[PDB]
Ligand binder design. Sequence first.
Ligand code: GDP
Ligand code: MG
Ligand code: ZN
Lengths: 201, 39
Amino acid sequence: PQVQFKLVLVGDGGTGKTTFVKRHLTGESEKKYVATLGVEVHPLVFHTNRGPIKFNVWDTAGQEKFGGLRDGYYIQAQCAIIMFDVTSRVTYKNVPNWHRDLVRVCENIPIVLCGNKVDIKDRKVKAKSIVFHRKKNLQYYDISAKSNYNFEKPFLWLARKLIGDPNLEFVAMPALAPPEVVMDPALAAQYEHDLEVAQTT
Amino acid sequence: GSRFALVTPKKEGHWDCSICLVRNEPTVSRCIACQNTKS
Ligand SMILES: Nc1nc2c(ncn2[C@@H]2O[C@H](COP(=O)(O)OP(=O)(O)O)[C@@H](O)[C@H]2O)c(=O)[nH]1
Ligand SMILES: [Mg+2]
Ligand SMILES: [Zn+2]
């Protein structure tokens, strides 16, 4: 008898969705395979100041590379993450298609937009170009799955929206797989600055 | 905080699908997401 939410993780193939969800070690060890839909559900626990929350994150088995996803994948989703790859403009271009497919089934669930792979120096999709979230009442974050950079931020924002408590906090980070790449602290600060001045403009 | 501990889901007849973890209504015997029968 525990608080939990179905979270659907969508985006073009190759954007890092599986790598991202896999950072949460317990969500990986306790994942559940859904053979009818071809999905791995990762139960991700986060410990908040008001108790534990579990995000049951639905990760595809790659079917997104060849067409749209079936209704059952989206059914009863209570939140979502839309991911793209900041080194591939086409994956950003397709964000509106994923958003559309989402709201067709689930309507106005809270959604976070995530630009992944910001550990890669040669960034193609920069803060100035990232505007789809401003138009649709979505939050955005840069992320780097392979370095755990900003891993908790999508989930914290979603938790605050779902619970209706802007002061909700995580009392500790979840146990995450050790970083495979280093996220340069200066590049991270630069990017965080780039996103701020673009919110003003 | 403690005075506002998150309220446990109170579910009478509602069941959590053991395959995909979606919550289903008491009336249905088959999960509306993954279409597996209650288990
Ligand atoms: N440099 C870097 N590479 C990543 C990152 N996330 C994923 N990759 C790689 O991008 C490729 C696709 O990863 P995957 O998780 O399978 O993408 P998916 O198809 O959306 O699930 C893989 O070779 C990953 O190693 C990241 O954050 N930084
Ligand atoms: Mg994948
Ligand atoms: Zn099910």
